[PDB]
Structure formats: C-alpha cells, structure tokens
Amino acid sequence: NPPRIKRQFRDPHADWWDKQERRNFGEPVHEDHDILGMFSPYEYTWITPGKGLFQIGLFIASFLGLCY
Amino acid sequence: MSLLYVLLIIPIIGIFLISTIDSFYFFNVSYYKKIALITTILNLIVSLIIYILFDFSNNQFQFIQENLDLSFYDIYLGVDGVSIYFVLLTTIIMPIALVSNWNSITNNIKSYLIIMLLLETLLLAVFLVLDVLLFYIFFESILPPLFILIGLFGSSNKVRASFYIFLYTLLGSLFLLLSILTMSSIVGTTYFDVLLKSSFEYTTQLFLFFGIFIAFAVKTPVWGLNSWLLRAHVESPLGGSIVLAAIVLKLSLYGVFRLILPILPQASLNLTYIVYAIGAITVLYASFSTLRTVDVKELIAYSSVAHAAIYLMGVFSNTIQGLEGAILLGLAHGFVSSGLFICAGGILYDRTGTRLIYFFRGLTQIMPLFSLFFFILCLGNAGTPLTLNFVGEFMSLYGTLERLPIAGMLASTSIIFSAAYSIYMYNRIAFGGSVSLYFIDCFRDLTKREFFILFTLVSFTVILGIYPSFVLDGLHYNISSVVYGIEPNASYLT
Amino acid sequence: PTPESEAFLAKKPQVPPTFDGVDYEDNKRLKQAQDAIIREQWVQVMMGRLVREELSKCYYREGVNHLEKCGKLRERYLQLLANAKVKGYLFEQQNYWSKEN
Amino acid sequence: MAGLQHYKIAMDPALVRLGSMISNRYKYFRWTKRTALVSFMYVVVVPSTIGYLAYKTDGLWDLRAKRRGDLISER
Amino acid sequence: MYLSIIILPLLGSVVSGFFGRKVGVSGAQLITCSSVIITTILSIIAFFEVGFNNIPVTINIFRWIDSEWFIINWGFQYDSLTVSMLIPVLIISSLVHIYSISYMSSDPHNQRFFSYLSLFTFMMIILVTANNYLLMFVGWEGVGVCSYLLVSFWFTRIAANQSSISAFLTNRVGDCFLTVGMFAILWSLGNLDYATVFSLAPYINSNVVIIIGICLLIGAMAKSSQVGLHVWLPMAMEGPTPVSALIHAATMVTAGVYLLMRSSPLIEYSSTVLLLCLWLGAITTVFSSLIGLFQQDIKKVIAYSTMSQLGMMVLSIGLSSYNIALFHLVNHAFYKALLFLGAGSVIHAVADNQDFRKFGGLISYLPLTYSVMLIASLSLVAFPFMTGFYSKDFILESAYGQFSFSGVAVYIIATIGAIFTTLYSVKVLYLTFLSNPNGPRTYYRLAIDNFFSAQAIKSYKPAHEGDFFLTLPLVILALFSIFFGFITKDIFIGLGSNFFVDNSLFIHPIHEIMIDTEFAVPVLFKLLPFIFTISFSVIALTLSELLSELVIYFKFSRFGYNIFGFFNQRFLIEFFYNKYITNLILNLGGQITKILDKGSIELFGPYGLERGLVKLSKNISSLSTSHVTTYALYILVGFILYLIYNNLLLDYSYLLLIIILLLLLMMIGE
C-alpha cells in the first residue's frame, strides 16, 4: 500500500494525467482509494482536534457565564 | 383447464416450440428470442385476466380446480390477495428480464431461454400452490436451473457463485423441510385450508419456528448469511440477476405469510425481539458496508439486503400496516432493483466491460437519458415519496416501531443511509466531474431498448407511488386473516 | 336508514361473529365464522373513518370554536380509537373464553 | 474481453490490481487478537445488546389513544 | 383557482425540462415565468379570498394511502397561514425566474435550470397547501430533491458535488426524525390529518406531545439550519445565485419555521418543546452572526445572515407567538431576496468573483446595485420605520414582555447577535462600495479616461451594471423592504387581530405575553436595539477608512488570531462532524466489508469449511491404500469396535466422542 493521504493534499499544478483527481494514470493506489480522492469528506486543517475542543469549551464557558 | 394451470402451461409450450422449431424451418436465433418473449407476454396477459376476475374480499381461494383424484403428492392451485400481487410481479418482471438480455447473451441462446422460461413456471408455482410441501417442492426446484444459468452465462467468478447460492439455499431449506415434515406428521396433511385450522403446542411452535426461520434468514438474506447474494446476484447474467433480486428474494417473504404467521403466532410473538435484533443489525451493517462497496452491481446487490431487512421487520409486526407495507415494499423493491441492475449490469457493463466504480465519472455529460432514469431509480432506492418504495418503507417501519419501538428507531435510521449510499453512488457515476478520462471511446446514450425497459420500471413504481390503492385494495381482507390478537371489548361478541 | 345495496347483499355474513357452536370439521361454517369476525372488525373501524371525516368538517366549520362546539364528535372518535382495530380471527378461533369465570 | 464487444477503456493496471485484491481478500483472513475482537464486537455484543433492549422493552408502551391522566407505560 | 395554483408550476416545469428541445431556451423561459406569474397572481386573490374574508377552502381529490385507520388523501386546504406563506413564495419565485433570464444568459443549460426552478415552486406549494402531515412531507422531500438538483447544477465541479450531498444527507437526518414524528402521531391518533391532530391535541398524554413535539422540531431544525444541523446552508451556496436567493434564503429555509407554525395547535400544549424552541432559536442567532462577521465570501456572509433571521423565528416560536414569526418570515424573505439578487449583480459585475479582499470602489460603477443593498441592509438590521423594524424589533420586545429568566436571557443573546448583525451588514456595504479599490484595474477602467490607443472599442470591461431583467426585481423588492412591513403590521400584529380565527395558528390564553410587550416593557429596552444599531455602525465605519489598523493589530495578536479562525472556521462544528461522524461511518463500513464480509464470516463459514473438509477428505482417502492385507485389518478393527459397543453397554456419548476424536485426529495431517 502507498502511504494513504487524501488526494486533496496533492498540488493542483502538477503534471496530472487526470487534473480533477490529481492522479497520474498508473499511480499505485491505496486500498482506500474510494474514500481518499477529491470527492470525499474534506479534511479541515485549521487546528488539531485537542486544541479545537479547548476553544469550544471557552465559548460554552462564556455562554454559561452570560447566563449566570 | 383452470386459469392458474394455464399460467404454468404457457411457458412449457414455449420451451417445446423453442426446442423443436429447427425441425420445421438453420433457424435464426431471433426466432427463439421472439418465441420466448411472446410466451412471457401471453403469461402476463393471462395474469391480467385473472386479476380482473379476482375478488378482493373472499376468504375462499379463488380460481381453484377440483381434482378429487387424490394421490400422495398432488398439485392444487389457488389464489387470494396475499398471493395475487406476487404472481403479477413475476409476470411483469420476466418479459423485462428477457429484453434486458436481448443482445448480451450471444451464445447458448436456446439454453438461456429454456432456463428462463422454466424459472417462470416454477416461481409462479411457488405462489400458487395450496400445500406447504407443495410450497417447498417449488421453492427448491429452482436451484438446478439457477445453478446452470450462472455457470453457463455468468461472469469470471461464476463457479464460486453458483456453488454458494446452491449450497446456502439447500442447507437452509433442509432445516425448513424438517419443520415442514413435523407439521404434516402431526396434522396428517399440509393443505392450507386444513393446516391453518390446526393448533400447535407452544414448544412445538418454538422448534417449528427455528427450522423455518433458519431457511427464511438464508433467503432474506439476513446479514451474515448473505455471502451467496453478494456472489450470485453479481456473477449472474443480467436476466438472472433481475429474476434473483425481484422474484426469488420474495419467496421467503411470501413464505412468512403461509408458514409461520397462521400456525406459529405464539412463537412469532415471543421471538420477535430476536427477529428484530437480526433485522436491526442487518439494516445498519449492510448500509455501512454498501457505502464502501466498489463493484457497482455489488453495491446495488447489497442495497437489496438493507431493504429486505425492512420488510422482514414488517411481516413480524402483527399489525395491518406493517404487513401491507411489507408486500408493497417487496413489490416496490422488485421494480427499482430491477432497474438498477439494468443500469449497472446492462448499460454500464456492456459499454465498459467492467463494474468497478473507480472508472466512472461525469456520465451525465454524454448520457442524459441514462442519468435521468438512474437518478429516479436512486431516489426510489432511497425511499423518496411518489415512489412505491416510500409507501412500503413508511408502512413497514410504522409497524416495526409500534410492535417494538427500539427496533423501529434503528430500522428508521435506514432513511439516512439508504439515501447516503444511493446518492453517493449516483454522484460518483453520473456527476462528480467531467466524463472519466479512462474512457477512450465516447459512449452512446440509452438505446430504445434500454430506454423502454427503464421507462416501464420507473412507470410502475411512480404510478403505484401516487396511487398505491391499486395494490392495497386487494390486500385488506386477506392481510386481516394473518393478524394475531384481540381487543378487550370486541372479542367474544354475544 | 340507507337502503341495503345489491352489493351489500352478496357479502352480508349469514352467521354471527363468533366461534361458539362451530364444528371446525365443517369447512363452510368455520369459514363463515372467520368472515363474520373480520367484517365486524372492519365495520367498526370505518365508523371511526366517518366520525373522523365529520370531525374534520366540524373543525373547519367551527374554526377557533372547535374546542367548544365539536365536543360530541371528538369523544365519539376517541372511543372508537380506543376500541376499534382489525385484530383477525385467529386468536378467537384458537382460544375460547367465558364470561362466567 | 467479454462475450459482447465493449468500448475501449484505459484499463489502469493499478486499479485492476486493486479490484482483484478485494475480490481475493477473503482467502487471506487470519485469526488474531484484532480480528477476533472486531469479529466478536460486531457479531455477538452489539446484536446481543439490541436483543437485550428489544427483549426488556417489548410491551413497555402503547401510544394508542392515550390521554392526560393516563400513562404511556404499559407494564 | 385553488388547484390551478398547484398544477401550473408543475406543468411549466414538465414542458421546459422534458421538451427543452422543442420550445428551446426562450420557449422554456416564457412558460416557467408565465406559469409562475399566473400562479402568483392567483395567490394574491387567494389572500383576499381566504385571509381577508375568513373562508378556509377544503379541496380533496383522491385517496393517497388507505390502510385501516390511515386515510391520507391528496387533499389540499387553504387557510390564513398557507396563503400568508404563498405570497412571498410566489412573489420572489416570479422575481427569481425573471432575474434568471439575465444571470443564466451565458449558461448552456438554461432549459434545465428553469425546469428546476418551477419544480421547486411546485414542491413548496405542495408543502404548505397539504391538509395532512404525510402529504406535506412530500413537499418536504420535494424541495429537498429540488435543492439537491439546483446545488449540483454545475455537476462537473467536485466541490459543488460535496455540497449537494451535504444538502441531501443533512436534511435527510431531519426527515428521519420527522418520519418518526408522524409515526407517533399515527400511533396515538389513528391518522395525521391536521383537523384531527389539532382537534385532539389538548386531550392527549403530555408525554406524548413531548415525544411528538421534539421530533418535528428536529425535522424543523434540519430544514431551517439550526445550530445542530446547520452546515448545509452555507455549503449550499455553490449553486447559481438565484437558487441561493430563492431556495436557500427565502422559501425552503422557512419550511422548518412553517412546520412549527402549522403545528402550533399541538406544540402549544408542551412547554418542554416550546422552551426548547426558545433557547435553540436564541443560540443560533449568536452562532450564525458571529461566524458571518469573519466570512470573506459575500454569499457566505449572507448565508449566516439567513440562519440568524430563521433563528429569531425559532426563538419567536418559543415565545408562544407564532404570528410574529410569520410576520418576520414574510418580511425577512423580501429583504433577503433583495440582498442576494443584488449581490449576484456584484459577482456578475466584476469577474464572476465574490471575495471581499479584492472588492472596492464600485460606488459609482454600480449606483443602483449599491442603493438596493442599503434598503435591504437597514431592513435586515431593523432600522426604525422600515419593513424589518416591525418584525425584528418586535421579537426582542416580546422576549422581555414574557417576564422570566428564559425570556430576559435570550434578549441579551439576541441583542448581541443583533449587535454583530450590523457589523457584517457594514462589512458587506463598505468593502464592496464604500472602500478603496482592492481589485485589479480591469474592473475600474472607464472609456472617459484615455488608457489604450488602438483597442479602444474593447478591452475596457468597466464593471457595468445589469440589464432590465436584472434590475426590475431589484426595484420591486426595494418597495417591499420599505412599505410592506408597515402596511401589513396590523394584519400580523395589530392588538387583537382576528386574522387567524380559522385556528390556522393557535395561541393558548395562558401563554399570551403580547399585552405586556406593548405596555409593561420599559422604553429604554424598546429603543435599545436602535441605540446599538446606530452606534456600533459608527465604530465599524470608523474602524475602516478612518483608523483601519486597530483591527489588524488585534488580528496579529495570539488572542485575535485564535478567535478570528474559530469564527472563520464556523465554530469547528464541521471539522468534528467530518472526522468524528462522517469518517467514523466510512471506517465502520470499511471494517465490516474487510474483517467480516471478506473476513471472519468467510473463514467461520463457507471458506473455512472448504479448506478444512478438503483437508479432512484427503487424509481419509490416504488410508485407502488398496493393500488387501491392510483392508483386512480395518474390517477386523471395525468388527471389534462393534462388539465392544454392544457387549459393554457403552454410553452412546462415548461413541459420539470417539467419532469426534477420529475426525479431530484425521483433521490433523500426518
């Protein structure tokens, strides 16, 4: 298996046999190809999961403080 | 010669003419296909004549012919509401199955047509026999023609597929046979009109229930006993697949109405929480699994598993709505799954020679008639309203929720995932970019044949989706006979 | 009363809705008993359909005053909703019961 | 390739190899700690949980024509 | 007339879509617009016929579903509420069909686009004209399918494909809850027709109503983008702009609001759902408005703005006053169809571009386009004596009018959301018209200023405005955003208005708080939203073009950078959704296909049996050596075993265990 990365992390300015999915014709494919291409759940990368949950708790605490 | 016996005789005459016409005319293959098609058309015409004469509120079996020359194993035929629509679905589907393969067989055409015509006589016999052993004899008689159909006309893995569907069905049916033989020993007869009159003891009903349920679970199929469907329904020829999904899956559903609801009501009531756990599990596990299936026909084959769980939960609801919904969903799934297999196994697989979903993209751009019907069939597979699939799903799920709410809620969740896997497949094929760069040659759109076997299937589901009364009117009184229970103030009038 | 139509002559149950006195060996009379059970259940339920129908016309006709004017039609449906349900003949066929118990 | 001639496709070797691996994967399954636990979670526990809840709550409620002063609990 | 309003958009959609080859592009535009306009006019009459003279009209055509107790008919019913919602639905649809004559002039799929717009109108009309919950749910699923087909209209775009699946699946979650809700109605009442549910509502188990009420609120939550299921509406901005204006900003998003309003005679008897109505609507106001402040896309700011107005309707539903929510739904629809359609002019003006960070100038290039925004913006921020003033600035007062902790708290929440409302209102207005040119010089190059030498006839592209078809709806919607609110405020608020005595909406006497709203409320809180609106505008207007660097200083701090992204990343209610919900199911499907179906169930099934039995079969056959002496020994041993079993009165269990052992050993090679 190749290292499994969402194909969205490929660059859109590479020699692509298919530009839409950013794949060369005969590139080795991960067994999860069906859920690793462009048409797939977007992987947001603004923050990491641990830090993001901390920020939401701040708003809930602020919301709770407003109610009190 | 009863009309019901006429139904079983026409396809046998077609077999005779197919296999003798060369002695009266090298005969052209087109002749064989036309004999077979007209044969199924006249069988449909007879089933329509029967339906006009059929009476909606009679507790007597109708169009029965008196035999009176009793033997050990006699064939009595009769029809009531619960069997009338399965007979119609078999007569409508089989002509469509014949046209769906008109151009794609190209070898052993005589054998394909004779097998297809024989399957019609057997499947019709299943829904018409008025005896429980007679039911079993026809439920199993279809395996050897099914075994040889797949092996003669199937895809690359048709050897493993034909073995799986034969051995699964036989093994389960052998447990159903044991249960059936116990019934005939206690009662002395398996005739419907006198076996339903009998009353089995609770523990007898319990052990009779396991034997029958083991067979009906292999044939539903339930999740975990469904390997045979994944293999057979995909490796089969397109006509085989249509018959396998739209008619053969229904035999276990019709068999629940004749073999367990009337005679095993205490067992059914006391074991619903086991049927519902298996039914709930199948709805989720199948739905998640078909979301990750990469063969287009296997995705469509796997959808049949999820929907069959919903009408399996309906028939065990003991409610008027669940039972009507179960027949209406089983009928609805017959049209829609037939169309989706024509779209996948017939339209895509003939153009490309492959069924992997990875190779398809943007087909709407060059094929707008395929996408128009494909979308309507993807909506119907998702239970969208104005399809007979919604009326059946809503009535089947309402009965499941009322009989046992925890299973109803879980089975309800199928409203999400059916939509999920049906629309996701639709987008990766019809939408989702421009035409796939793997196609070197451009593709043509639907031929007139493909358009009219899809228009016919999408017409039946839509018209029945707007006016389901056409079917419900002939189920109300007969469905009532299979309900088990009493009201505090209506029971025991004096 | 509404005259009994020709159609509502060929399907009238000639037998009472019960299983007492029925010889289960004799097929005609048992089948008639099952017919009488089902038809009584359905007859009782279409009463709710007509009451439901009337309550609908009452509700619109009365508007806001539906909470005070449609009371008799409200209760009649509720009683029917409490009692009427097609339950089949199979339980009563297989299970005798007596009031003097 | 099949009995009836189809259009010419760019049959990608990598995708062909992927679709064959999937069809042959069943031959290579093995019993390990991971595969035993997952196969025991899906087949036994989760189904037996639903069966427990279905069994425990069968008949617990009826919604038909329920009014104020009358509960939904049936048992 | 009553049934002609039903079929006319349907016919217009069938001819345009299934005969776009026959009538052509202009033929389709002529039919869809004509059929919608004729339908629109008839609704105006129906408003007089039904709303003003108080004749509810019942029309039943044929039975749809008939099983024992369920008799669901293709029946339609006109009352005050359905003709209230039919007015904006038809009016903006008429204006959107007309508006699209220009916006899609270069699209190669005009017939299909107009076919979809008329089908959605048909599905909206079915949703509100139905006289039962099941037939209503058809329009519910109908607009959802029409929404999916109109988002994915440019189906070659991968990102708009993901949007339509988000629109389809997120809403489908709501429909599951809604489907369950109709089960609970059917289970308890025998049918789900409106005249039955509301005739028996005051009489059924209170716990039942909570079970009922919660379900359709979750369904209402999905179709009106509440904080839980809210992620489809801004993703749904991948479709053409009129679709955004019509389906995703003024008509369909108001289906969840309509569901609670029609169900008012039922949910009124459950404070638990009503209280959940209040806080839920209150939450999505600050949730939406905060996110919208930090959106770079013009449409994406507006999507967050719709979610806010709908949240105030959901808020108003909790205050037991559904008429004000109805007042705001009609009022919000006009200002919104104005804002988006005029916005669409801006994207059409420059380059088909919609990023704020490259917009500027355009105050003189698009005079009319700017003007309609300002009318819409002040109607949206509820400027005094405007259309939005009579609706938005009455919900807040109603909340204080109910004197309770919940009522006062949501005031504070809504006011903060109302405070943040005007900021993106300012951001939309300023950054596109009142700011320095941030786009390329190609947008701002007039022929008056001599720039080129030879190619003077072309190569100018001076960001011109639209044609008549683009501006006629813009002008028409402007009047509705000024005078319609004042004119109709007596029908919908009044003091003791009897516009709903046909019971269409229902308010219980114990839940009335309107009297205290007019008198008990203090003047300071009544004018408080105006004070914040006219004040916080000046800080936002001073923070740009006057200071213009206080904000960037906040942006490049560590505190501001974390806040800015969080609100720009929409509270992260889509990162945890995509990873911990969506991909969890995808991995669950992966595990089941790979470990069970292609795995254990094959090994503990047919494949294991095939492996073992072939092994077992081969070992037994190896004992068949054809050595006649060896066979004689076997016969003797079988002879001896049969004598032992019968002579020694052996337990049968000993025999079976021996056979199991003989299979075990034979199962072992060598």
Ligand SMILES: CCCCCCCCCCC(CCCCCCCCCC)(CO[C@H]1O[C@@H](CO)[C@H](O[C@@H]2O[C@@H](CO)[C@H](O)[C@@H](O)[C@@H]2O)[C@@H](O)[C@@H]1O)CO[C@H]1O[C@@H](CO)[C@H](O[C@@H]2O[C@@H](CO)[C@H](O)[C@@H](O)[C@@H]2O)[C@@H](O)[C@H]1O
């Ligand atoms: C989508 C729904 C959204 C959520 C809305 C929920 C709204 C609340 C509904 C909750 C509900 C509806 C059924 C839900 C499913 C039915 C259909 C499904 C949906 C159809 C579409 C489920 O409540 C069940 O919970 C079970 C938990 O075990 C309990 O069963 C049993 O628990 C143990 C004994 O209590 C046993 O030992 C155990 O053997 C049983 O198991 C019972 O409490 C009850 O059966 C009913 O709740 C109501 O039950 C009754 C009796 O309690 C209560 O009345 C009270 O009784 C007196 C003492 O109680 C009080 O003095 C009195 O003041 C009051 O009269 C209510 O107050 C309320 O609680």
Ligand SMILES: CCCCCCCCCCCCCCCCCC(=O)OC[C@H](COP(=O)(O)OCCN)OC(=O)CCCCCCCCCCCCCCCCC
């Ligand atoms: C209602 C109760 C009915 C009871 C049964 C009554 C009879 C039912 C049918 C039983 C078998 C009938 C066979 C009919 C076909 C015989 C005529 C014939 O010769 O057909 C030959 C056909 C093609 O071969 P040919 O044309 O000669 O070679 C050309 C090569 N280029 O070759 C073929 O057609 C062979 C077709 C494949 C084999 C048939 C399908 C599998 C059957 C398994 C047989 C065992 C089970 C039998 C089940 C009977 C029905 C339950």
